[model samples]
Target: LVHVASVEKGRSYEDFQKVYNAIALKLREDDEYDNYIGYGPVLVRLAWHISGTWDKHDNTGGSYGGTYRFKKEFNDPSNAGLQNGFKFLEPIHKEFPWISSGDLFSLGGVTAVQEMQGPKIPWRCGRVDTPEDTTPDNGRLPDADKDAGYVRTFFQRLNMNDREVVALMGAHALGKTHLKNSGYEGGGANNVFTNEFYLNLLNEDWKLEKNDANNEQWDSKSGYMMLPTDYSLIQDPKYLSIVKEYANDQDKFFKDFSKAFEKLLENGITFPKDAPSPFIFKTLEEQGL
Candidate 1:
């Protein structure tokens, strides 16, 4: 296994919770990006992309290092639009300088998801920052233009099984794909924090039309979009069943996503049962004082 640097000694849970509050506050403040869709989705995406780099065999390249703060990982093409997430966290890091980059980044994702009404993802602290040379190369992330088979095949490198792949894509339920960001367009309209992605897939009358910019949009009365890869969940036979399952039951989506997301975040690390159960943070509205 590839060795990662250890978290600075003497840092405690309260310090990290303060960092969490900083991130939670910023997420509330930046509620208008991508047309009032908020920063929650990208933050989850940021956590996923950072953790997604783990190879599993050698244990190199997961969220353990928080290396994406470095330019080499930041410049990754798969990470095209994640600068928004990194920029969002800058001030929080500035305030809590003692927390490891790995801890802060992963916690930001956990905070974003729970605040947005998703499940609690159990997180642990120990990922230390590494040098630029330690940053993994780009293309480690999944492609938007690919089909279900390719999506399934690619995530295998990350040790994700089919059910996990389906659960992670449920995040598409949150954010849109910017053409400039990923060569795809219009996937996140009516962006309430729910498992509506599968509903949108099953109910909408999607057209295979090319946008003026030449990208495709899965236009419907709901005004949402799904990439070819996103649509493949329904188009392909094997993935279709899981798509239908999530579409039918929001509770199942939540349960599966919680397990899968926690697994995603905890890729390279082993945790004991005594490890703290993930904390669920209240949204800014819910935390009224």
Candidate 2:
């Protein structure tokens, strides 16, 4: 249930930074993917799907195992469309085969967020892979058709509280859901990372309707849609209060999201007190691109 706090053998920030740069550079190049949304959203989604499998209690699954590389996890119904993210990272993994799977998968997320003009997520290294059998079975990830209580209860397995849950869901702002992929549709803002999700949720005149997939989804004239789980943030009082705060205060959202994302990535992996601090990579702009 614990990962020993060890850096990847002989790997340091520079090595990981190189990987980050490669991902960021490719995000810039794949500008035509997903109608110019490029690969940012999918990479972010890939990171979340990989990390979201963690079960904090016995630690049966987590980013530590990187078992998504296995066909079993790769073919999960819930993980449709993530293959693009995996194929995208294949070259980088080839270039730096020394890096562990967990580290590389998690770092892809951190890199995507910063490159997309989202918050800076400080990430740590060291997550070793396990056998394919270690991968958790399908259905471990949450269902998108559920309500507020379901959303609240589902994340409890990962140890995320109201604030963390709300902040993490803000990631919906960056990506659109494909009906063929998730039985859901676009989520207002696509390609760009912003707090527009919360803003749209509060402001949009959403209508309850069954999407073409026959799943109940919130639809709006802005040509956007929200899964029942995404709408749960506003239906639950505790979550809605935080959502309003985040909607009004962008900085607060970014700060809280940074913390929540790091927590999500590090769940079930213990770092010794003497372990190295997290690394906050400078964005391409910060480095004077």
Candidate 3:
């Protein structure tokens, strides 16, 4: 059986619409963070990191619990730079005190993607804030230093296949890695989401080098840096084929990414078959921001 909703006052599509608009507005306002990359990318990562902890076998840590509110999940080394996204969401949380942490976190990612002109991620809001007790121990998230085999195998826990994995990684086009945060460094676009991650991966000559953190990373004169794991996409023949397709077709990339991201956020939750369908949020652009 799936977990029950956390809040007593049930929320409908309209309630989440308010939350989405608020998140979208803040994303547009917070342009200075991450060197003006804005909160969109980190929000996406925050939502992803929080949801990525699920163990399919037992359905442990996932967006359903919002366990990231606790120390173990928040302080996970994998979540190093996401505090910024949290801080950004604080005011919005204060404003909409009724929204649960899980819904807020996942909704923030949906908002970020829409506001960034990436895709329309269909979002649901049944996740409730569980106690810190619900928090799982760290080490569930993937490492950035791994190779293709590791990448392919690691995602199986999330039940993600090759197409979904590649679609999700295209999110890398949104923000560059910070050396202080992840011991990695730079990218072509900062705030504007695009499929250019594949473009750069295919076009640029990224020299493998160690940053000040003495970690191996791919660097390019175009001011982009890719983690070794990011490089794995092109290294594996299968991932490379999808990468090439996304690099060539922006519409297809957006469509696949939308489906994968929705799946990512909803990974372990057990919504009833009769439950309402996911909501498609509008962007600030669509709303004439």
Candidate 4:
């Protein structure tokens, strides 16, 4: 199945930027969401979950289809808390009804990252909606209870390399996991995006223990928590090296993350030769809004 990048009729960078501005403004105004972590983390997670469903072999799922709007994909066990992200984007979609569901979902992540002071993620505009039947079955997303080998193997289906996987996982720095949602609890939540996830992995004193959900998680003295999958980074030699590099150099992490994130959102879609280039949106602060 070839998913072509067909830009929405007559839409340009300025048009998409308007949508970005609306998302950014709402993110600022809705400070009460998720205990004031705001919508940044959940939005990014939503984009990741939506795009993570891609299978490189057949390309059935991914951002190209916007299939998450379907009930099956939305109700995926792996996506329990992401309804919040979907709800967050409803108003933006209503205002800019021309944007595709895939575009809006992915762009919400771009806007959240930039608004949270992360690196700029260059995002493309075209992702025509596919029918509900195109939605991939549940269980395509990774399991948080697994280890490094599982992490490496799972991401392969999405065509992510070790470096890309590590860079993408760095996004864990932004949001906390809730037990009611993902069976994990407590992350040192912060709105600003940085290399803190890696730093915490290497620097913290983590102990293996079961959470209230009876799932194994690495708990730190500082009250932060890491899923078994997250703690696996330090246990694996190759992943550990990348973790150290990211932890030590914030700029490198930001740059690498920006590139990997764009690639993640762009997977499974073939842009036409004449398609418009990806747009790097300016933050509200940059625009002095």
TM per candidate comes to 0.91, 0.97, 0.96, 0.99
> What is the lDDT ranking, best to worst?
4, 2, 3, 1
**Against the correct fold, how does model 2 do in TM-score?**
0.97
Residue 158 Cα positional deviation in candidate 2, in Å, after optimal superposition:
0.3
The residue-by-residue lDDT of candidate 2 on 97-177, one tens digit each, is: 988888888999999998888889999988888888899998889899888999889999999999999999988888788
RMSD, one per candidate, in order: 2.3, 1.2, 1.5, 0.7
Candidate 2 Cα errors over 4 Å, as ranges: none
**lDDT of model number 4:** 0.94
C-alpha lDDT of residue 115 in model 3: 84
Models sorted by TM-score, best on top: 4, 2, 3, 1
lDDT of 4 by residue, 1-289 (tens): 8999999999999999999999999999999998888999999999999999999999889998899999999999999999999999998999999999999999999999999999999999999999988999999999998999999999999999999999999998888999999898998668999899998898889999988988889999997788888899999999999999999999999999999999999999999999999898999999999
lDDT per prediction? 0.79, 0.87, 0.86, 0.94
List candidate 1 segments past 4 Å from native: 2-8, 189-191, 271-289
Q: Which model is ahead, 1 or 2, in terms of lDDT? A: 2
Residue 34 Cα positional deviation in candidate 2, in Å, after optimal superposition:
0.9
* Residue 101 lDDT in candidate 3: 90
Off by over 4 Å in 4: none
Q: Please identify which of the two predictions, 1 or 2, would achieve the higher TM-score against the true structure.
A: 2
Clashing pairs in 3: none
Sliding window of 10 residues with minimal summed lDDT for model 4: 223-232
Relative to the unseen true structure, what is the Cα RMSD of model 2? 1.2
Model 1 agreement with the true structure over 1-289: per-residue lDDT tens digits: 6554354487656666667777888877788887998888888889999999988778878888788988878999889999998888888888888887878888988888877877766666767677778888876777766688888888898888877888888888887778788777776544355788888898899888786668765677567888878888888887889988998899998889988888888788755555554555455556561
In lDDT terms, how accurate is model 2?
0.87
Clashes by residue pair, model 4: none
